[PDB]
Design a protein around this ligand. Structure first.
Ligand SMILES: OC[C@H]1O[C@@](CO)(O[C@H]2O[C@H](CO)[C@@H](O)[C@H](O)[C@H]2O)[C@@H](O)[C@@H]1O
Length: 263
């Protein structure tokens, strides 16, 4: 059975030619609205939230960890390094790496966060520690974005990611200073204007992280503060049948617009 919200999302999915996954958590009453909410999707750069959060967790018991400089060598650069390239033969602190990963989607910065955690399994291990039993990070940048249909590597479900994003930003999976820091980072994202944000009332505050990959995978995860009512968490994942499909950030905007109706 489906609600009119789900029917609208199914129609958007049909017209787009792809596979759409949505999870909304309304924290006023802890209801969820799901569309393919227990199906796996490739996370692409939305996984940078879990990596940054895992480093924030480490910093709860190593007070200055975020301010630790990390060397950036020429060989560390991968395919998209808008911030790290400025620091080759220099340094970036773990805070600077987290900001670059989250707010610019810098892939060298993500690889440094993964290294800090001991490899992709360190990110997964943090997920498990905060009760996310679904997330898995298998690979580093850039290969975590291959997004092959049905491949479980580097995937999660919309429901799981919404539950976790809620725990990280509105709950207490992180300590007080750390939660606030994650929210500050997410709110300042520079890559999200065409995705969830484009579908929401303009007076709302939004923290988000986008992702993009092969198979035209186009993703966004967000914490949202509507005007006058309790915050929301919204996950929108989208992927397509052909390897070289174009991005479809508008699909995510349209999913957000649908979900916002009646909110
Ligand atoms: O930034 C370097 C740091 O990233 C890791 C992954 O956490 O390795 C990635 O970057 C290397 C250098 O560009 C690649 O050769 C490697 O395949 C890639 O995973 C760490 O191993 C490395 O210390």
């Amino acid at each position: 059975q489906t609600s009119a919200v789900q029917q609208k999302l199914a129609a958007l999915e049909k017209s787009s030619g792809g596979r759409l996954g949505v999870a909304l958590i309304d924290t006023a009453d802890n209801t969820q609205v799901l569309y393919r909410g227990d199906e796996r999707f490739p996370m692409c750069s939305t996984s940078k939230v879990m990596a940054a959060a895992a480093v924030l967790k480490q910093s709860e018991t190593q007070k200055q960890l975020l301010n630790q400089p990390v060397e950036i060598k020429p060989a560390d650069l991968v395919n998209y390094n808008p911030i790290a390239e400025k620091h080759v033969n220099g340094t970036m602190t773990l805070a600077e790496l987290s900001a670059a990963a989250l707010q610019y989607s810098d892939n060298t910065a993500m690889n440094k966060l993964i290294a800090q955690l001991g490899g992709p399994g360190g990110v997964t291990a943090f997920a498990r520690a905060i009760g996310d039993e679904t997330f898995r990070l298998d690979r580093t940048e850039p290969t975590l974005n291959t997004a092959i249909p049905g491949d479980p590597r580097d995937t999660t479900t919309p429901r799981a990611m919404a539950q976790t994003l809620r725990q990280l930003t509105l709950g207490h999976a992180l300590g007080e200073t750390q939660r606030a820091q994650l929210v500050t980072w997410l709110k300042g994202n520079t890559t999200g204007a065409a995705s969830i944000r484009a579908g929401l009332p303009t007076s709302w505050t939004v923290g988000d992280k986008t992702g993009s990959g092969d198979y035209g995978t186009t993703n966004d995860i967000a914490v949202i503060w509507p005007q006058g009512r309790a915050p929301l968490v919204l996950v929108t994942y989208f992927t397509q049948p052909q390897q070289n499909a174009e991005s479809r950030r508008d699909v995510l905007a349209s999913a957000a617009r649908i979900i916002a109706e009646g909110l």
